[PDB]
Design a protein around this ligand. Structure first.
Ligand SMILES: Oc1ccc(Oc2ccccc2)cc1
Ligand SMILES: Nc1nc2ccccc2[nH]1
Length: 184
């Protein structure tokens, strides 16, 4: 991921005017919509947390967790660490936490600046399926505009709900309680 770290704006967009900051969310949402479309209930939830991290979750099948035969690490870690996709978001997040519910197990992993802190690990049992990512944009990269703007996210999620009919998209702001539900 060092090519991304060297020139973040070439991958995510302008890192000073808020463009790249909000594109971080959109790249994660792209992956969440993919996952939601492959499951039964087809809902994603985008949450702006009070510490200006964002989480994105889906109720799909779960990102695959088995060891990648050539890379020698979990498939999830391959997606997160091989190069626009969520690997760029990971590289530019001072922290990124993920949870995958799949085949009866809960799997968790934490990254800092794209670096895995331990291998993907089973932490418990579950009867649910789906994926969640919460990320803290790196304040070493994103300057000036560092806080998420609710309406910038809402405008894009609204567009996506028309294009991805039948996918339910909820947006929640824990800073001021504002919420929306886009479903076409
Ligand atoms: O709801 C989501 C959020 C992020 C997603 O992308 C991922 C990529 C690799 C591992 C985990 C997640 C997939 C689904
Ligand atoms: N603070 C900080 N910034 C980093 C960038 C790349 C890898 C590790 C890092 N720790």
């Amino acid at each position: 991921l060092d090519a991304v770290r060297k020139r973040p704006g070439m991958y995510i967009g302008d890192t000073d005017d808020g463009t790249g900051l909000h594109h971080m969310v959109f790249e994660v949402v792209d992956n969440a919509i993919d996952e939601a479309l492959a499951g039964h209930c087809k809902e994603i939830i985008v949450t702006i947390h009070a510490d200006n991290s964002v989480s994105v979750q889906d109720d799909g099948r779960g990102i695959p967790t088995g060891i990648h035969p050539e890379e020698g690490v979990s498939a999830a870690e391959v997606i997160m660490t091989v190069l626009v996709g969520v690997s760029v978001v990971n590289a530019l997040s001072q922290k990124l936490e993920l949870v995958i519910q799949r085949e009866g197990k809960i799997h968790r992993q934490i990254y800092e600046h794209g670096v895995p802190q331990a291998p993907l690990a089973v932490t418990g049992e579950t009867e649910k399926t789906g994926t969640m990512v919460r990320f803290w944009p790196s304040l070493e990269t994103f300057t000036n505009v560092t806080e998420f703007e609710y309406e910038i996210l809402a405008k894009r999620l609204r567009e996506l709900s028309f294009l991805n009919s039948g996918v339910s998209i909820r947006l929640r702001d824990k800073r001021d309680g504002k919420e929306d539900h886009f479903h076409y």
